[model samples]
Target chain A: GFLPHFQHFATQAIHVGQGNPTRNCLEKAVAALDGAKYCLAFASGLAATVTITHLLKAGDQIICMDDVYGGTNLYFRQVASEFGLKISFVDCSKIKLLEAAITPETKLVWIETPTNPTQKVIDIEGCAHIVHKHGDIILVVDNTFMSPYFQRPLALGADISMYSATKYMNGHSDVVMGLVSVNCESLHNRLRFLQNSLGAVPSPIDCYLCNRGLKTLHVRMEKHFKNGMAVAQFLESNPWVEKVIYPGLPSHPQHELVKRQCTGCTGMVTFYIKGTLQHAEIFLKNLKLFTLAVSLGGFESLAELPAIMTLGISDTLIRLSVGLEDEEDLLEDLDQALKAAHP
Target chain B: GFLPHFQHFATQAIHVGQGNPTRNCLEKAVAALDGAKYCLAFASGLAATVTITHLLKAGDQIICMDDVYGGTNLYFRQVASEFGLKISFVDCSKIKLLEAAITPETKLVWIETPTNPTQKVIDIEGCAHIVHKHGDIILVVDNTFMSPYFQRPLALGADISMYSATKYMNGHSDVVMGLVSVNCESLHNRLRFLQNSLGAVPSPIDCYLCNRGLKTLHVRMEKHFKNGMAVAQFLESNPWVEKVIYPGLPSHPQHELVKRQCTGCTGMVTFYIKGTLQHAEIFLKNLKLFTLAVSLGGFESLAELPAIMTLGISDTLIRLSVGLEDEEDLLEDLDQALKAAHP
Candidate 1:
């Protein structure tokens, strides 16, 4: 009976057809938390990454960190590169190395600070300065390991902040969604168009859950940091544990950068159990508290050996996502598992 | 603590990772209903279309119906064609016309029967035989309007049955999802890889809603057909309606084919009001029942004039999705609206 008109953000969230109210609410929450003007939510982290690449045409080039998430690396290295986008991988932790890699064809630089599997932190501001020096090069920061409660990349001079909201943002692990927050209106309009055109948008229910998840983010991240440090300390002291790698740990090379960047380190702790692949398998078999699974960042702690999976990172390495459970109980479970591995 | 294994469809739907259970359940229900061995769901109709196009390399060709869905026509003609996948659009109703269009490089033939807005019916078995004659060519049918309850394209020898599950399948119109069903193991394996690799998969909540929506598809589609028939009949008897197109009507050119194909026609009726654009607008303005909107296949009826938009079909042409309301009430609403337009 009437031509369409603008409604309040909450009203628009529920009334906007496929871009429903729940999806709108979640996007608004993400944009506000990241301190950006607009955000487009996606079905998965890779979907968000895939849409970013869509901004590039045939002759464009992209520079990305070598130690990025497994999906990000594989997509750039194996797939998107074949579509006429020249991709160059470098250790972005070293600003000089990243600066040297960008050519005139370079249109975008992807940063995954506190890099996946390995806890290497890169300076977002340092990379942004170098990327800006080259005309039209947009810097995209993947803020997955650290939720907005921990870090806001857009505040640090990044053109865009991407999130695998499946992890920290929707900390409950019931939703698999992605988000991209940007300050620029031009990018926002173009990305909103691409999000609809690409058709990888998240569902209303997932968006609703993501909004609910964000409410508890501050409390969740604090506990994750505390439990992460406790686990890192216990693992470091264990004679059977060859090494422990966490940004909060002083042994980590980027400990200072971690403090300067995110509010605190997340509950991502990777370690090498003292022994062969067989010993690591035995250790995992003996664990009762930690569930063996592929994904991380949930209330129930998950453990996985990437070497046995397609990732093939390290045979003796075990990645643990410390859940919001009793700290003493978690530590005792790891201790007994490590002890059982000693033949 | 234990190695992973397969679970029952119901259990998997509620239990899969990242709220995996619900997603798996929808996929299973869709697959079983469509008479296909496997089914993969996506974020939207176009996402499914884009992924299906992924099967082709640079030199491949495709044949599609000329008066197809607006999005389908735009995507293939404007975008995919530029990317080197040659597209040929014709009236697939004429099997000879489709057969003549095929090339050795043609990899796919897409059919959308009782075609959008125009209501042209194409022979599925006829096209499937012609496509199979080329040895490996795939015949993909868009069953968005007539869901699996009405039409099982796979059973009719189609290699794939594609759907914009946002419509009749998710009958309430709140969710946006796409699905593809196939019996062949090879195609399933390839599509499953692409569904994950391309990552256009729908969210778990949407999948859950889709499954829940499907439980009512039988009851809802029945009412849609009943109400649709009454509306088409009433329009046909009215002097102000120049033409009314619906598959269920005996007056429809493809009435025989509709009976041969789907179990029943969906609640879609397109008509040309016997007057100017002003008269049609008057009719719409007088109506208090039909909601003026773009999308169809929801609980409430929706009306849209494509001519006013860039579609430019005919100023007097109007599309209506007859809802599940009582037949007499809908007829009364239209009667008074048309009377107001005439004066």
Candidate 2:
């Protein structure tokens, strides 16, 4: 209601996002890569996700992946189900298989690439092109795993790109926020309306911290990717590990497609232990330094049993978030724990 | 899932609105008020209201006040309309009017004494008695304005007493939290189940802040009420002020009722200026120390145009919150501002 027109191109990206007034005047001086839209932020990741989706309506269905971030799954189930919209999850890479699942009602396709604790990869452009075939269908990619610099979803045919700005974007675990971007006028209109209506606006101070985190995203991501690959390789050689899942690994089902889509795979890694729930619990309990918790994308080495934590899929899946510390130290802690737990 | 089947008198209020670990102890403290069966807290006041209503099915009709907090009206109009339950907002004072409004559908008579912005005192016990006459009905009172210290709604026949906890109880604008208490077994069950389903639980930290605020609420309220009464008296005597609407004053429309019902009037004071919106704006702009904000109930003395801010019922109304400041200082600043704005 405050703003009416947009002749200034800078206004579209920079102005609308910044609801904060007390931030550093010069966005660049504040932090280099961190200079986000220079303004306002959203409340929570789920709040952001819901705000983005408020663009769609009753008849429009969103094609989402099966291995969703748990809260995202809960959000869609709790809120969207009431709206009379349908959602289907697929292996996602099998674009034709996904196409079979999409009915005429499908209005948007959202893919969370390197999906959650499982590290399942989605072919972004393939799904984007498939969704775009139907008129008015929008493709939204949640680029939390491989961030904007690491993987540009918008350039790869995604109508809009979204991220849980908390995880790797915030770097530290102190803040949790979400981001949505699109060139489409209709999409922007819906996002803005929902942002105000839901009162899901992030406080100005959290925006300051999140913007601070984005400055080091490029540098932080490089180390995250390095640690992730090394840890995945190390876990593969360990006897306690049943299977290691990573897009960087050739054995991953979507390894080739990951090469075609992502610029880099950062921080997150997932592996299954060849043991029961108690053994997985023992590994977490015995491990030192690595935090046993329910989150990733932080600079700290966070480890969680996916069965109870994120995916909640199996009793033995372990998700690892590679941290800034020496990889040898992290691996040594895990190896020592692995021997104690499994043996 | 774990508790024993107990009598209504035996249970205590939710031990912290479910997920919030910090409220775990405060839930005990809040429960100490009613000797409650069990209690839980909620995300927002709206969440608590909706959850309580949702816990009851198709046959229940809730009788709310006509001048209930504006959000209550908006929520009932916007979202609750689809829930297939009946809600009627009556003046809530006149026995004939309230009795006429009630139908076979009416089950819960909701009360808000010292109504939002206006500071009108509702006939809490009168309304409760009327509802009790027709078969079975429970009266729920919103004790946000006066809090439990000054007025215990349950003692006045309110089956469940609720608070915005964000206001006088929380005493800070940082977190919007809700609390509900009742001695009825079924109602407590409804609140607990809906709390989990609504899932608008406060964070551990917010609960901690509210607890800290609660420790000093008695101290804060003493200053607030003592200063509030002095300001109300000053405004009533002033020529520039068209009218003062403080319940503590003999001039107040509901002063006699307030004297009987409440131990002391709340920290907030409402006054209508002799002039228009422009006059109110000038007065607000000229104030050097007071803040222009969306909320009240903090330590700072602040004033806002009612029509522009909180209650927003009338164009010429302004609501002033008397803070911890000295009565002489507040009156001096207000008197100067009123004189300057008028001149």
Candidate 3:
């Protein structure tokens, strides 16, 4: 009957009451991995951003990076704007510009290291030094592209280290979650209060799944690095590829900064294919192995055209979240797609 | 290699890209069941409440039912208040009181039918009529207790039907999700825009689990109705029971209103033991079948003292979410607990 089924379901889902063991375990695990005193998990990456932003009240000022996630941009411009939050987008890579943007009302400085699609890397320590000079300003680093395995923002003096755990933390992409690791007890408490008050908590089952994914993050990220480097190297040599952008490559402008700040790079590799919008469309349609999609940091490799899908990049620019597939197969797939596009 | 496991995980979680089949299916199913043109799924029940409330701007006034869920009360008083939202708690059961409470700034009227713990049934149509007459005031009904199986607020003329799907909607008690169903396209579009901007969306897998729970909702709700009625009747007949508050019971003050508003009853039953706080504690401790917990609308029977767990009711007040256990066993367990408490 439904009674026994119900019992089984309850035992599995509830995990013994409000102190959900699975959720607690996952949170503790994430906190330890990030080398922070506290961690709060949320429903999505944007939820974490929202909660962190709510740490400030109306009329507060926020200086954000010019290159950020589209969702974050929309949230700041459209939703948070209604609440009287003033936001200025600046090229955070230029430390002087970031400093110039700060005013007395500025309560937050937001940046995404190895910025989305464009792959611009900001200096966390430099930003942190500048932000702390202004009393009470919180420094937040969106460490989505580079997982905690590669970068620890708090260690570099960031007040809050944020993640779109859906991407790299939970590399298998089974759960869409957000995480914030902070060393300061006061900020953690404030964010925790908003977390509960806002109530955008992730499901316990999703937490369990994310925890399970975290178990293999080390192994998965290792393969991703290897495949990503191999793919970048392959693309750099390809006649059909106009240019390749990868933090791991020496050709990247921020390669030295990446070496100093991050231990390793993620599977994210961006490049400009030698073609127009029509040729890019043909390349996307002809791809047999790589699936064209928006989200990244999944185990399965995904390719997206930035112009149409996400960022306002050149129509021919492509972003590849290289999966854990064999290096040869990934290279072969790209080769065939590039050739198909040029033909 | 970890590649195949990654592929399996991606396929299961992603279900082939941005057009998530499982999430879409669940949303469609929920919308169909509620007779709503659009339904949006969220991270938690409070997330749904927060999203609906965001429909109004800062300085917007909200008139909410006094007997609302504690979480909703907290969100209004604490979080939304920071955004300059003003809230007033009034007993919305009285239509005239609801009308009188409305001011020019009142942009939203919020109510919970069969209000949490106390099971106070409010008139949805009456409130809706009053709200609509005022011009532009959105009527939102939190239909967590009486799942769409028993009562649908949108059909009763509510602008929005909200739910903490963690309860009866997902009676298995696994997933924590929120849902809002609306018939208006303009409201849906605005909400959809906010949903994306806010990004408190539920996991695709959680949505799948919720949809599965809905499949057995009719059957589970039927048994819940039977168990709830049996427990209510038994409590009323007990020597240790002073009062029983079940909308299904004729002794209830709003029994006729319940009959008019709902098709059936849920497994929620509240009562006062014939003693002090000590006796209530004794009863709760001696209960072998029912678990002591906070959340309701699960397959397993749960008993909680409102004084300690939820509402600020009398120390003697006990709330029971009667489960789908055998009628004989549930009765015996309650009988033994009551006897032990009195002894």
Candidate 4:
């Protein structure tokens, strides 16, 4: 009941402990980044997603994008499903298809633009309008793939914008956290209560790391964008590459929509290598610079074969998390790995 | 799901996230201290409590100690109660009373030994034996008060040993976290799923704080115990003190129970002062060394009136969390505060 009042986000993140600093400052900083009024930081991005489900009662329907983060999809389809939530996975980019599936029980619509591995840029404003037509439905955007530096979904009419601070927000890949920012006071109040009750909140020290991470956010985004574009272009021209899916590239199906909806893009490139499953495995194993891993949005470059880590994808499909490295070094590393695998 | 395989606990805590040294080291240290095979760290103590509730379904019931931590009480009574949980508050020190409250739906038996604001020592072995008789109920010990340094509930036959690592585990009062340690594989499996799904897990940085705090646990706890005994003895002899409640004190009603249960006691002492509510308030305000705050088991002493923090408590009742400060310094601070309040 005694909330420690603070004037600024940076100050709050450092003083978050009953206004002790750090967590409050991190929450404020996150809220500010997304251009929202209030924010809540969580222990992990999944924790934030789990808490969002608490907003709905049993039997409530949540319409989610067909292509979302594997963890998010797993929780919604499997874990929370047992907790009594009914979910429908649909193409969020197709507003007509999403609207057709919505019913009176549909309480939330989840959209993940520039989706994991596939890199699909769904229309936040398009889905937000359709959800608002139902009067009670709230549209939530998972902005993990595109950090707030490039996209602010709230400005595009989405009710809530969420992020996995574990990724680009912290950048170092050391801390795992999640954040949600919103404009509505009543919704914020409800979420704040649920956060306290559920107790999946973030620690003060990690909040401090996130706050420090914010200092270099703009600087990091610039390089990530530059490297991402370079990597995308190189992959497209490679003889061993089947396709390169990046919103910044003209070849992408939704590049025009991305240009119109977002200010810029970050360092995520999804592509299919023109090779067999064994070749993909060989390429991943041969990579010297790109570490074979699952998580993205870290300082070090990471390469993962989606078929190995997740389902419903070809073995040759590689999700490359372009890191803050020399573009020439990354290109050379990829060239060597590709030569080894394709030969 | 590719659960990262580990050789051991200590090796696992620091190496938890892609071999991040801090978090894995903390988890391993906690598990070793509790003599548990499995450990999971969380954002806060309340997060650990809330996550424990996930072990049961809506129609299930939890029987808890009457004088548990105020936050725990609030959660079970106000928050979890709304989510279809049936909770019964009983004097857990009396195994007969706890046994009487059990029904077919009773799934959890919550015990808080040396409970908050009131130093009531609940018998972990006694409660555990009673709960296991029904063959389905679990005994969860809130070891925040004594910490594993003074007591190991699992060794005494309890199912789970939980902690608010923010307190004794972190010792410095800089981090807010919770941890659970268990020996049972089935329980560990269930807890791990709930932890990830609930997403209330702790960050690597806070886990590092807990790890660092544990390094000085033995040293800090020794001083805490020494200072606690001295303060208890002083309070008992003082003319302005009505009653002093410390497990180490011979006059305490459950002194024998505590002696039988724990290796030793930490620095928590609850007592009633000889005066009105205003006198108690004045005494709290006059204390220079002891901070007027809620948390306990930190490096610094903290004093609070129970009636102000917890409900349905006498206004004159004072809960003093004796810290790592020197015995003479603490005794003098208490003496001066009492003299000022009485005058």
Candidate 5:
């Protein structure tokens, strides 16, 4: 005999569990940092990528950058394709190429600035302008490499700014989480509903950990920038290095764009050893300070041979996530490793 | 110029971040507890559900129970449907209804035993047998309510036993996670691939927390069972209670099915108060020990009016998740609330 009048109160109480305080706080913090109206957190970076795809329906085309994250590339080509999505990968660093790839069906344009492993810096503002010109196309910028402390994608006019918070946001490498920020209410509302429906939400504890990490983001990024510049300079002059790919370096192909699009650079520097895969192996084996591992943007430096680990890249290419360690120690470590690789 | 020889070592190191010792330990523990050959963890229970759906492709039909979890029901009817999936909701407790709902396109049979607040227990083994008899159909049992302590779905013949570890596995209500246990190597391999590709994985810290909670599950569930039985008996005898629905009670519509399907029941009980919605609201507001909230299977008692909260239930129906609190105190609390409602 329960009347409808009390239904409202009951419903509110039952759904109370959905509004977790820690998770809400983190979401708010991220939104504010990114200069966006709303933000949603996920279990992992890939979860955010997958959920964003829910915004589009079947047969909709997604134009993604060629040098996208390995997991995301796999999802778009293998999994998303299974659902009838049409995906086209292009080098989005060149605005002309991105514009040419778009068709009538193109509903989403996904670009990872300072593209993973390769470090190709795409112009977010340019891509956003082109995407919006086409009417209804959502432009998503993967701002994982440059945490909001260094770059704000929403400020650059992108519809959504995506992140793999596991990397720089939680610089301790202890948490694996994802987040997406947006200025538009409609997009936020749709993605929020999809987020709940998809249920890839992060644990409250993870949120708290990531939020704690965020408090030190400014400090960590500053040190990372200083160390990255020093390493890039050292690697450039070192006899054991073929080429260094750091956006902060003037020699980088997109250095000008990096300056225009980002306030600073992360400690991610991709380079080639002076020798073959054997030398790369020797270099990694000899490194004492940098852990021989995948994943980047952590407090402890990590080094990986992209060809063997991520695949689809050159054998001699090594990606370094420079940590906040003393610059002299990192320089000495690299020097010894380089010498050992050649010896 | 890195050679292929070192590529193997580099690849291994780069992919090392994918494996977390704590997460592996928890996965192994859950698998051992459930007698499953393989187990995969996810961010939320719904994430697990969504990932399992990846086993099926587009145009496939899924026959789900009529009374399923609200989030899951929404995914199947709204989100999954957008991807060309056809879904049928049937009274799975009635084997014939489930059997009749199957078509050539039907690829998945999803059911929640002791269906939500209604407490209708479906025969897991019977459903599995019927589903398998159809050939190529996957049977998934949402085992959130019972947890592995009271029920082992894999042992009961379910192809995939899924859980929202948020509820009971992590009985502390501190972590939101999902898990799936399977016996088949092929299914495990495929789901594993999909898990990485989909990337809704949980954080290592969350995994550790869930593992910690799991260690005390047996003890917590035992007390929950004791408190649940006492509360059910009290509610059944109370004059203000019109009817009580609990799988552990002989009066449950599917009591025989419950005995056949589960070893015991958790602290979930549903009943209709003898008065209107006002009375139900008053009853919930008057409870001191039981908090008015959604979600169940936690260490703390929670009460909610299903009609107003979860909807799709009788107006006077109230669900109680009797927690680890003392039996006498919980009974007394309920007694006072029921009296206050009619007063």
Candidate 6:
């Protein structure tokens, strides 16, 4: 049982949403698109994200984790603020940072854990406390890196869980969708209302694709955990790698908190190169088996320059979305990449 | 070579409206979908019609032709007052009726020839001349029945040609989409802005589908004309049928207009049963071939009671979209439907 109210394990996940079934199906189905709830299916993830952010009025304030997803950060800082919404970023990983970041005008708190290309894990529950303490304001957690199977932020006392379903939930390269799920019924209704008013639903066919992929969410996450742990160790022992920030690794600063709080870890791992920024580019270009691209989550091994492709936050940090590919092959491939870059 | 402004065509066709290319492709590839410059594809033709009406705003008046699409009438009569727009419905077969309808508030003149179940055709050029006399209001023609291949509304001087792309363009009973096209640069920009601001863009898949279907549009319409004509002729001579309303029929009110303006008649025809409304319902139910369902312009034959299935302007009109099937087979199916209903 997820929660006492959500305890009907026998119930077929209502292939529908009372809030906005069409949008739910849409936004959840693509990156797990199921956009807001009702606006009808969104044209794209960018379209969905834009519409979502646009819902904020002319004078609203949003407090976001400093280590959030790149596109989201851009939406908040570059686009959202232009419309008069002020976004302040702080380390939401610690409870104090989140509490310190909140202002009276803060209407929403956006959280991302195993955050972006940084691989810094934030406490979804701890951040939510600040939301409740404030008595108002929406608490949204970006669940893209960990996914629902690995870490259900909504289940972890967080109000909402957000995802670029294109990453893992889709589990394939064929689709691009985004999703946000809320544990609170009232919050769900509000999102549904906003979604209907905004109209960012995804298509019916895309919904079907995401729906089918969801059947193996747990299975996929388990494989990710298995491979990710070994990869972290491999990278740490390699002379070319300066640091590996993976929650599953015991050496991770928040490894103890991760063990105590989170249910699972996903395939994402961030590492710094021992050499230079050029070395990272060379490593990416030299790799034959791993594709150098923007997206992650497909069974195929795809590696990309995050600063340029996704987050565009910095050129130094390298993020890998470990896939359902063979563990040994991946390790061997990492070995090759490190040799090329570390040399 | 197509136009002095290929970028306008390219941009409008590619990113013209905020429509997601996938949705555009999906509807485009349907047997009935046509990939327009920027498809602001809506849920229903009514949505498309009203959205276009909204594009004009309040205090603006539209000089709509008599025998408009039933949805347009409902929107103009029921919805327009709420929005503070005015409508002047003129029996626009003659140029003077159009001349008489024009006023300073008239920013747009809307026309639907061979309109719906009635098959009343209007002179596109003459009507255009009358509306354009003011030199301020733009002319818009709904080329629903006589699709682009049969009638080029833009070439005939109308500023924009609109389509309820669901019926013939989708050519399947699966989905609904709509189109509004303008030759003017400014007007086209306005449409593009509306598509983005309103989030009415279709998915890329839908756009792909629309594009795919458009490749064979010429061929499908060609078959539709022949088969539709055959069925119209059979009904005209039938003892059980009171009247057949089809552009191909010489007795039709708009036969000469069809002759002058349209290259070929479309696949739609409406007729009255010899007995009554009950008799017609029986005819629709008795049919083993034609499925009694809403929406038309698909690959399959469909029977509809226009009085109920969205076209409720009149109770007597019974609409059927003759589809891309063998002429003899369609005629035989009709003969049997009539026989079974009467027998």
Model 3 docking tier (incorrect/acceptable/medium/high): medium
Let me know the TM-score candidate 6 reaches against the reference structure. Answer: 0.74
RMSD of 3: 9.2
Cα lDDT tens digits for candidate 5, B47-70: 888788888888898888886444
Model 4 lDDT per residue over A110-184, tens place: 888887778877988888888898569888999887877778888889988998876334556457788999999
* Complex DockQ, candidate 1: 0.45
All candidates: TM-score of chain A: 0.89, 0.82, 0.89, 0.89, 0.89, 0.80
TM-score of each model, in listed order: 0.84, 0.76, 0.88, 0.89, 0.87, 0.74
- The DockQ-based CAPRI class assigned to model 1 is acceptable
How well is each residue in A180-212 modelled by candidate 3, as lDDT tens digits? 999998999998888877889898888888777
Clashing pairs in 5: A1-B276, A2-B276, A2-B277, A3-B277, A276-B1, A276-B2, A277-B1, A277-B2, A277-B3
* Candidate lDDT values, in order: 0.79, 0.67, 0.81, 0.80, 0.80, 0.65
Instruction: Choose the strongest candidate by TM-score.
Output: 4
* lDDT (tens digit, per residue) of candidate 1 on A1-343: 1111112323333332333667876787677777778999998887788788878877798888886445567766644644567888999899999988889999989988787686788999899999998699889998987777677788888999998866333445557777899999899998887787667887666777777666666667778888988999999999999999998887888777777776777888999989789899999999999989878788877788888754457789889988888899999999999999995
Model 3 DockQ, alpha carbons vs. true complex:
0.52
Q: Candidate 6 residues A22-73, lDDT tens each?
A: 4454444322221222222343444445445544665788887775556455
Residue-level lDDT of model 5, residues A294-329, one tens digit each, is 866677888998778843567888889999899999
What TM-score is obtained by chain A of candidate 1? 0.89
Q: RMSD of each candidate?
A: 7.7, 7.5, 9.2, 6.3, 10.2, 6.8
For candidate 3, list the clashing residue pairs, or say none: none
> What 10-residue stretch in candidate 3 chain B is worst by lDDT?
B1-10
Error of 5 at B30 (Å): 1.9
Return whichever of 2 and 3 wins on DockQ: 3
For candidate 2 chain B, the 10 contiguous residues with the lowest summed lDDT are B1-10
True contacts kept of 2: 0.00
Q: In model 1, how large is the Cα lDDT of residue A17?
A: 32
lDDT of 2 by residue, A50-165 (tens): 55565666667887777644556655665456445677667786778888887888787778887776776777888877877777788877766677656667667887776665
Q: Candidate 3, A248: how far from true, in Å?
A: 1.4
After the best TM-score superposition of candidate 1, give how far the Cα of residue A285 lies from its true spot, in angstroms. Answer: 5.3
Best by lDDT: 3
**What would the DockQ be for model 5?**
0.55
